[PDB]
Amino acid sequence: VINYVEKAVNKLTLQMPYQLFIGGEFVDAEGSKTYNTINPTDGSVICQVSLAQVSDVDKAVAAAKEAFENGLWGKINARDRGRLLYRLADVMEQHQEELATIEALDAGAVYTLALKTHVGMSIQTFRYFAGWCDKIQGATIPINQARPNRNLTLTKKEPVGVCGIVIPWNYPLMMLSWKTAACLAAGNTVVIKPAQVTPLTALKFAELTLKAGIPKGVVNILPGSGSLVGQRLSDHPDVRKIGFTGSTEVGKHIMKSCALSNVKKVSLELGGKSPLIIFADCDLNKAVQMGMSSVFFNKGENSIAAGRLFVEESIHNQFVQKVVEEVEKMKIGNPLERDTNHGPQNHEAHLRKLVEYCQRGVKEGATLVCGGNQVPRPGFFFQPTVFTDVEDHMYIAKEESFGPIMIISRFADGDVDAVLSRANATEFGLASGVFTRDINKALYVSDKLQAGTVFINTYNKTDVAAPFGGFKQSGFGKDLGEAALNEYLRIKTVTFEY
Template identity: 85%
Template sequence: MEEHQEELATIEAIDSGAVYTLALKTHVGMSIQTFRYFAGWCDKIQGSTIPINQARPNRNLTFTKKEPIGVCAIVIPWNYPLMMLAWKTAACLAAGNTVVLKPAQVTPLTALKFAELAARAGIPKGVVNILPGSGALVGQRLSDHPDVRKLGFTGSTEVGKHIMKSCAVSNVKKVSLELGGKSPLIIFSDCDMDKAVRMGMSSVFFNKGENCIAAGRLFVEDSIHDHFVKRVVEEVKKMKVGDPLDRSTDHGPQNHKAHLDKLVDFCQAGIKEGATLICGGNQVQRPGFFFEPTLFTDVQDHMFIAKEESFGPIMIISSFKGGDVDDVLRRANATEFGLASGVFTRDISKALYVSEKLNAGTVFVNTYNKTDVASPFGGFKQSGFGKDLGQDALNEYLRTKAVTIEY
């Protein structure tokens, strides 16, 4: 993969719409890091010894073994095609399993290139299997198949629920689900404003907003709200929307037409409900599926755009009263999703309190989108369960056997 990283980045940019520079650094770069990280775990998977029957010491021995599950199916989304493959496949292989992976129907190319590279790297036949096709056909067959003992899925909550049901009915196969999000980002007035603006924009516009942990709603303290909005608008105007293969492009096309149409409808719903459209909200007038970076303010808690995930470059801003930390926390947690969250403040006590109270699998403090191969990643509530990355990810692809011996 390192030898072919420029080719992989080019394929990823063409296939997913990610700008080449981001595809090279993140889509491909983190994929390589992920395989290196889990390669280090291959010879470090071990069980434990457990003392039992204390009334008769030294007469019994219990130990546990961590074993591969067997055939594992993986179904990945279209926003980070190669990176999602790496996040799940690396842990699956390190645990000693074989994998059947279904890439998203609209972004299969880097997965197929990965299969070619896997064969060239000497991975035995039958260990890595790439099976393109539709979710309704291929994904369903993998969910139903009696020889598949584990299914890892990243995608929408709606599809995740269906997969979970199918896996239960078929053979009660193990499931891990990384699903939708509506991640809150709370920005207090005592923040570093320059950093809050820069990272706040990244939290929404990174990878064209096609990012599962994107900040779906920003809560900005009322005393800095107007200034924050002004700064964001100034930065949005500087963004270059265009060809993802152009090294100077900041913002490429959305992945496919159906998703572009969904973003247009999302913005129309916000306008209809009374939110203020500050900028954007439309398809860019040029060939391709380009959508303007968009900003809404005056977003009330009951509105559709306050509750639903756009999965696009749409910043949703609501203000909150200074000093009422518990109220903004209540509003931030008033969602069925719990994938990620964030807070910007110079007050370490406040930051720790907020990070404790936010009901999400990841909390970013004075940063955002800072994922790492060693840090577990996964959500709460209807954002799913199970972890990618870190040591925790190995447990998703292992089973624990207890052995007890009397002697």
């Protein structure tokens, strides 16, 4: 029997494992270390989770390795691997109300949105990649012949081996799903550091793999400190690929950790400060509604959030005036109310960091139209914020706030290259939008945006089949899509003479 933290809430009776997941069992940490996970809706302790120690990493990696080298996962057909990864999705469906609720407590996600996006996309991801298994192909190549003999060259795509996946707190299960699916589909096995503050969905997922008959020790999950658990993963000489999603500063440290250990492969999806340019000739009402989502989605905690909205001179004051009308209607409150539009922030820390961010923007001149402060009420809620009169040199114009904060800069009518320019003025390069009814501006601003993803007359429409990565300092590699896979496969050329 797996040990649960049992909690009756939201018409369910949650059974949450709270332990380490190493080789198929749920165990205590070395020395039975533990920490609390905080419910950000009221700031209470949810329960206590195992605190993975360095020994524990080594143990996890050793399980995964064995499980890849001699374990069932390594021997089965590509096709049958898919079968399991579909089952895995399937189980995840059958538990979705649960998973979403957990996520609702643990990360403060709105339970309706947790359902559709956090859990939904998750379920979707596994299904997608599941499909890619008997479809990962190599080539035969027309190598010059070494006459009077013949030659055949072929490639094989092989797994890379033991992987470490290290992820942040904004969409706990979702992130975990994105990479792990790609990882497991490519035939690898894995140790997962979920963000320390958000362990619960990750662990429940652990259990689910069991129910899916994921072979013992292909998946391993270790709640715990990045500085320690995550650090070992990168240093460990038996792991051979890191998948990372996190802050720029750590990503830099990670890549470094990888080079100094054993030149492991590494993928980075770091920050964004993505510009959304809204033209006067767009659909002004859809632009307020799309562009609010481009900031407020998942309480702002989001990689592709629009860091800046650039708005044609002619439509600006009316766009703002409209956004404030809409913002006043946004329902703040507990994630478990079907009611709620806007939930609480992920953990205290980040609310305090959001508080200062906004102090600071006001300090340096920008106009604070609304919000910019904690919502006074228990738990850690933050008022949707709108800044205007934001200028290119400002902190708030350069820095990734990662919270419900609209940053609006006007762009003078009928230059394009001149705003394009200001939008590519960052070292971030992850996402970007353009709203216009004009085909030419769209197609053009779409080449010129120095960013991995360009939304056109929409926002936040990632999909599990379209590749997702960064340029410049947003990192490299892709998540989701056929091209998320090359991160987790390797290519062997085989040359015969005959």
